[PDB]
């Protein structure tokens, strides 16, 4: 970034890059707020089923954070919500909240 502005080809590009980063920082803050909301919600929902799930996605705080963050890029599977037991209500609420 210290070198690109000298190029007439690459200067304006880098300027627009700084601009759009400065702009989207605010939406990143708002997304942090809503993401923290949903994270704490689903964590409180699923924390009791440590050894009753397909995987360990929403069992702890850090793992819930990992799962929900990787869900942004579609890199998280939807089987993380399913339970092993027959508590249909909890897993339905999980489906609804994740969607």
């Amino acid at each position: 970034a210290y070198i690109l502005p000298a190029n007439e080809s690459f200067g304006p590009l880098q300027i627009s890059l700084g601009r759009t980063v400065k702009d989207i920082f605010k939406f990143m803050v708002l997304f942090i707020m809503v993401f923290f909301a949903f994270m704490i919600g689903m964590f409180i929902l699923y924390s009791y089923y440590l050894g009753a799930k397909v995987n360990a996605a929403f069992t702890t705080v850090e793992e819930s954070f990992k799962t929900l963050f990787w869900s942004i890029f579609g890199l998280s599977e939807v089987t993380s919500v399913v339970l092993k037991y027959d508590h249909k209500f909890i897993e339905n609420i999980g489906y609804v909240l994740y969607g």
Partner: protein
């Protein structure tokens, strides 16, 4: 529970042997009662503004409807929790009143009453505490929206 629950859902742990596990599971902690009286105060304020403005004008704003629904859902979660705890303390009263032993596990109980000794996995799919947990999670997710 930030780092995970300590005991598996299959195991039942109790402070003193005579007590029913559901009494241990469904009792109100102090922060939960703080949340409860908090929800009661917020509901009082919202109902006061409803009585002032009138239902017709009150329903028009969709965000006010969202707030009313969130408060009612918190109330519903705590009501289901309290029904679970009432069944818990009634089974506890039965156990402490009629049967005498050192540990409850060795005793065989009437089935309708013995059900309240089961662990998390055995629980009926429509237990009021399950409804409480689900509605409480939804209510937390919605309460975070008041920003």
């Amino acid at each position: 529970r930030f780092e995970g629950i300590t005991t598996l859902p299959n195991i039942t742990v109790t402070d003193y042997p005579k007590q029913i596990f559901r009494v241990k599971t469904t009792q109100f902690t102090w922060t939960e009662m703080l949340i409860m009286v908090w929800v009661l105060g917020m509901m009082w304020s919202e109902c006061k503004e409803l009585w002032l403005e009138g239902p017709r004008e009150y329903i028009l704003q969709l965000w006010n409807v969202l707030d009313f629904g969130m408060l009612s859902i918190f109330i519903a979660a705590f009501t289901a929790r309290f029904l679970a705890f009432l069944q818990a303390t009634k089974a506890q009263q039965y156990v402490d009143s009629y049967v005498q032993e050192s540990d409850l596990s060795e005793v065989t109980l009437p089935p309708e009453i013995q059900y309240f000794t089961y662990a998390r996995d055995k629980w009926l799919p429509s237990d009021p505490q399950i409804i409480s947990e689900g509605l409480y999670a939804i209510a937390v997710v919605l309460s975070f929206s008041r920003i």
